[PDB]
Structure 1
């Protein structure tokens, strides 16, 4: 027989082929072969259900579809399935793999006695052998759960997005869990901007023992109360009183301390660790983890189970016994408990073979070697003996004041040996062996000034931790949430820290007001739990989908109504005194999907009195100083101005090289604005950076009906250039000429010839939409020779074919500022060229 195994990745195909062999043919079904519709390719409800594909009213008929370019793979798979006798669906463990397997099954057909569903947590010889020995049936319940999730997300996205376009702004999007993540980020932003840092001082003391050893302490009580001076003068007075006073070590404390290793990684823990130690965010962490799994070195990277197989435990215990030895074993395995709702059938993220060191990963990029090293170190550490520390605490008294030292000294290191700390902590030092009731001699003392920390901005990993705490999303979702909140323009990530765009605040407030049930963390958690119940087969998918859809439709039909009826409030204006360059009027501050901008109220006046003039801002970037550590965020908050009308901080954007603009955090709910001739810095447009040949200023890439065209930032100079196939940029049309007779090849358009210092190039008529460009062939210029402007005619005189009979193309020699003709084979240059030498085309090797 020949048995066909269908696997999503090609790398997974290669790795599994390593262990399957000649009897099995492995075919890589790249991604989702079958998916709900995407492109356009009571009639309103009909068009809505056709856009969705899903029809919620007609019992969720789904109309799945197979995307452009999948059909080749579908054909190949069908042919192989006709050839093969048993078809093996070896997708990954999770619901996404089950959905992919179901799609494959349903396309190929023959369901009942021809599909085996293979389940392995690692791509290794023993695991694959055990997986193929007794294959499972396709678990339709998990498929139904995945479909339920997909249907919910498409229902919410397509039904909400036109509402947000109408009320707030076109080019918004929405999503069930995405909106709740944005709500979390916006709530933390509001907590931060509300915060008003207090100020507190601290004093540090330097002492020597009678035995000449040296000790440094910190001062924490005055008059038996907490020592916390408010101002400089108070601190200086305290320092004086301290210096005058005489010090004695009235307290001597000692005690052993033990530290246990961390649990083996679940996916959220792996992302937090990779962020903290290696700096990888979420996307890089999960991409490298997926590569490491597909290569076969680590177990499946989507898990919330800390469990380990007996094989794993025995292997790692053997490794510890052989390398480290008995003191680090310890006597019995370190158990770790995952959540009761966790996929306890799954394993943790662990090495597939503990002896494979990270350096040995010849075929893994260095970042993946680092990630594997982190996984290996954690896995080894988790089973080792706890470290042992002995700790000393000292308190010293002088006058009205008491001052303290704490220190720990490290005496067995077992888990810390494999998994060291990144840096020494404040308590990772040696306090000298002062006696109980010892004496001390005194050295000069230092004050310090501090401002209370605001709540810390989310990192990608700390947001994933927050989601894991609340129960919003699941291990497979987290990377998609973290990506989509950024891609959709509600949140931005900078300094490895999360920042919330004003549009994210607007959309968050509107969605909370209208769709309070959808946005509430508890109902999101309960929905996720109900999908888990579906996967358990504790619940019926269609049922919960119907319940969701009924509630959602009630809330939508309420929300659609007019704002006086109680629907979604519009994107209300806030108004400021600035003169519109077109009509001088007062100007107001506005938010669009593009950003935050300055608008003139004539936008709301009918055509007769309409004004479309707009002014375009650049926000000030916060530049957090890594060297300031924990201070870096606090000082950023200190840097901000504060709104006159309220305690909320203010956010800053330039308007002129002479002028700078401050806007309140609760804009547009708060209408405070400030303008300062103490301006800072404004940024303009962006793209491929180019220099304008007519004025030396920066030039940037733009789109609109005549092209993806390149335009200069100097408002005094409308010099533009354009995009082409075999260069970065091309100057403007020294003589442009259309050709209806050259069709485009990637699109239905027609070609037009142009000229700049880049050379002479073809470009499609619908240029921003088509974007298609190529260099002309000499035979093409010969065919249209009559249309060519007088100067271009010589290029049609050029030799049309090289000596090999390869076809020829026209090129610019930047080293000699002249056109020449060259030939290509397989798209590569043949290394032949011909040049114009004053009426005599001449040819040779390049």
Structure 2
């Protein structure tokens, strides 16, 4: 009467056993047990006669893979086979997505069971959910397994073709990563934009206005307003300049400068201003959807200041320990049990009035219904309360509680009433000598906070901006109303360069572009940092010089491999395989060898990966690949950054003791971000 259940982790193994009980033996497999060979020694004697064995994929036989058991896992497999001898049934209880199905498949291929096999799938670890999945198994989904394998093979083939190019042309020991190099490109593209940015200056006037003489009961009696128009011409703002600091070809504006603006203020000093136009418009904010993988990583980054990787390790533990639903999901759907628990929680915590009128469903179409069933929300039909979870996850597990609290608040808020308020608009007029001038003020009231009492999104550190519960108080003003000028400050400004990415904004970008998946966002963000391509300056991601060199090589000579659209399209086709709408072998064959299928002008339609990469590379100069153009000096001489084996250093060709060509060099580190190394900075380190 003995049943064996296999999962990926000891924590999950202990948790399922607690729920299953007697007559079940629950073991862990440490994740994957087989992979393609990673070394010549991974190749078994039987295959040492196959020249493709080390590669591990036989491209001339429909991409047959060589899966071997990694030496680090041979132990695990031995024990599993040992235990299998003594049971009546095998339960495979890995995660329900393509990774988990692939593990199940591999266990079947490795153990070769001669007893019944049931495959359990669940998206939360509770006693009911576990019991249910045991009683109602799901057939192994081969389409999922084929999708995972296609991606595994693709990565192997990609590394095989592309790494040698990086080795000859950039640096040895660099490792190719296809999606990674796209993520890297996004970051490098932003740094270049910052480097080509040129600021424009623009001035206006800020006034403090008092309404208390014309209306003794104005609330508040004072406020601020900005100069918006002078003599029918609209004052220049930051949005009016392009990245080169020149005015955009649109409507007609005045750029004020210091002397311009203070002349206007001095000519105003004395007068009153007059309310020409007050307007109220109500607004209604709908609450945030429940968390999915990308939005959870974003909010944890902006609010808790957790890296993407950190958020996923914590979420993993919460899920394995029964606290939350599955944390790899692109669904924001809540089950009816969860909608009711949130509604109740909200009514108990905040009031009957703060509960949405009718229950709120957030049903967005998921890419694959087999891998994602539900948003990320507290597990169990009744949510474990934040205090109870706070006590269990105290001390060392404090980051786990903090994430749970974030998830709980988000779920609860998602069932709450709309935020209500008014948005205030003001047109104030006046006279600075000859010219008529317009000051403007805007305001927002939050009459009824709604879900915002339970959850408010955090604004991106670098982008800046206003939170969705921020209010600007303005007094009730009426046309004709005179206003007293309390103070006038002529105000100078400059346009700013485009903000760098935080992890939160990178994840957002990967999602909008269709390049990231719930299973991949954090591993993408993590790897580009490990491998040195990118590092953090505070909360900002900054590319390293080697990132420029690699990105440059790929853009110049293999552009399709790092094109945002081609990348997204491939991610989509892999999902197509997962659904059963495209075949593993056809896809690999088209991708590697070329074919007539795929988005126009893609790798597949351009002759395949193999012909694409294997051009004549002797035409590609390593020296230029490792040279990043910065600018010319005040003598017309190109100054570039050279990526050398000893690292990054600045170089320029100068006139020597005889003449040119003489290279003048100066060494460089992390301390100087690319957009910080200006000509001033460069000259300063060429000399000292």
Taking structure 1 as the reference length, the TM-score comes to: 0.68
Cα 1:306–1:137 change in 2 (3 A) is same
Query: Which residue of structure 1 aligns with residue 35 of structure 2?
Result: 35
1:275 aligns with 2:301: yes
**Residue pairs, 1:67-82, within 5 angstroms:** 67-82=70-85
Query: Which residue of structure 1 aligns with residue 584 of structure 2?
Result: 541
Q: How much is the aligned-residue C-alpha RMSD, in angstroms?
A: 3.0
Query: Which residue of structure 1 aligns with residue 678 of structure 2?
Result: 641
Query: Which residue of structure 2 aligns with residue 590 of structure 1?
Result: 642
Q: Distance in 2 between matches of 1:545 and 1:422?
A: 42
Q: Distance in 2 between matches of 1:31 and 1:456?
A: 39
The match for 1:260 among 280, 283, 286 is 286
Equivalent pair of 2:299/2:457 in contact (CA under 8 Å): no
Equivalent pair of 1:406/1:427 in contact (CA under 8 Å): no
Q: Distance in 2 between matches of 1:482 and 1:93?
A: 24
Shift of 1:169: 2.2
1:430 aligns with 2:473: yes
Shift of 1:283: 0.7
Shift of 1:569: 3.6
Shift of 1:330: 2.2
1:332 aligns with 2:358: yes
Query: Which residue of structure 1 aligns with residue 92 of structure 2?
Result: 89
Shift of 1:409: 2.5
The match for 1:224 among 232, 239, 243 is 232
Query: Which residue of structure 2 aligns with residue 802 of structure 1?
Result: none
1:407 aligns with 2:433: no
Query: Which residue of structure 2 aligns with residue 358 of structure 1?
Result: 386
Shift of 1:339: 4.2
Q: Distance in 1 between matches of 2:628 and 2:358?
A: 70
1:169 aligns with 2:171: yes
Shift of 1:32: 1.4
Task: Tell me the SS of whatever aligns to 2:269.
Answer: helix
Shift of 1:5: 0.8
Task: Tell me the SS of whatever aligns to 1:226.
Answer: strand
Q: Distance in 2 between matches of 1:274 and 1:149?
A: 29
Q: Distance in 2 between matches of 1:68 and 1:574?
A: 42
Query: Which residue of structure 2 aligns with residue 493 of structure 1?
Result: 536
Q: Distance in 2 between matches of 1:195 and 1:67?
A: 50
Q: Distance in 2 between matches of 1:387 and 1:260?
A: 7
Q: Distance in 1 between matches of 2:589 and 2:339?
A: 45
**Residue pairs, 1:251-650, within 5 angstroms:** 251-339=277-365, 341=367, 343=369, 345-353=372-380, 355-361=383-389, 362-364=391-393, 365-399=397-431, 400-420=436-456, 428-551=471-594, 554=608, 556-557=610-611, 559-562=613-616, 567-572=619-624, 590-592=642-644, 595-597=647-649, 616-621=667-672, 641-642=678-679
| Higher share in strand | 1
Q: Distance in 1 between matches of 2:192 and 2:50?
A: 40
Cα 1:445–1:571 change in 2 (3 A) is same
Cα 1:188–1:134 change in 2 (3 A) is same
Query: Which residue of structure 1 aligns with residue 116 of structure 2?
Result: 114
Equivalent pair of 2:283/2:422 in contact (CA under 8 Å): yes
Shift of 1:4: 0.9
Q: Distance in 2 between matches of 1:80 and 1:447?
A: 81
1:234 aligns with 2:242: no
Q: Distance in 2 between matches of 1:484 and 1:300?
A: 23
Q: Structure 1 stretch 162-171 or stretch 125-134: which is displaced more?
A: 162-171
Equivalent pair of 1:304/1:342 in contact (CA under 8 Å): no
Q: Distance in 2 between matches of 1:600 and 1:520?
A: 32
| Higher share in helix | 2
Q: Distance in 1 between matches of 2:620 and 2:146?
A: 34
Equivalent pair of 1:86/1:114 in contact (CA under 8 Å): yes
Task: Tell me the SS of whatever aligns to 2:622.
Answer: coil
Equivalent pair of 2:592/2:610 in contact (CA under 8 Å): no
Equivalent pair of 2:170/2:622 in contact (CA under 8 Å): yes
Equivalent pair of 1:359/1:369 in contact (CA under 8 Å): no
Number of aligned positions between the proteins: 613
Task: Tell me the SS of whatever aligns to 2:59.
Answer: coil
Q: Distance in 2 between matches of 1:306 and 1:593?
A: 48
Shift of 1:619: 4.2
**Residue pairs, 1:682-701, within 5 angstroms:** none
Equivalent pair of 2:4/2:87 in contact (CA under 8 Å): yes
Query: Which residue of structure 2 aligns with residue 138 of structure 1?
Result: 140
Task: Tell me the SS of whatever aligns to 1:314.
Answer: helix
Q: Distance in 1 between matches of 2:271 and 2:234?
A: 18
Equivalent pair of 1:472/1:528 in contact (CA under 8 Å): yes
Q: Distance in 2 between matches of 1:48 and 1:509?
A: 34
Gaps of 5+ in 2: 42-47, 237-254, 460-465, 595-602, 630-637, 654-663
Equivalent pair of 2:299/2:458 in contact (CA under 8 Å): no
Equivalent pair of 1:304/1:343 in contact (CA under 8 Å): no
Query: Which residue of structure 2 aligns with residue 688 of structure 1?
Result: none
Q: Distance in 2 between matches of 1:242 and 1:510?
A: 59
Taking structure 2 as the reference length, the TM-score comes to: 0.83
Shift of 1:205: 0.8
Q: Structure 1 stretch 252-261 or stretch 284-293: which is displaced more?
A: 252-261
Q: Whose radius of gyration is greater, 1 or 2?
A: 1
Equivalent pair of 1:4/1:84 in contact (CA under 8 Å): yes
Q: Distance in 1 between matches of 2:172 and 2:153?
A: 23
Query: Which residue of structure 1 aligns with residue 26 of structure 2?
Result: 26
Shift of 1:392: 2.4
After superposition, give the CA deviation of every residue in 1:813-837 in whole Å (9 maximum; x if it has no partner). Answer: xxxxxxxxxxxxxxxxxxxxxxxxx
Equivalent pair of 2:421/2:445 in contact (CA under 8 Å): yes
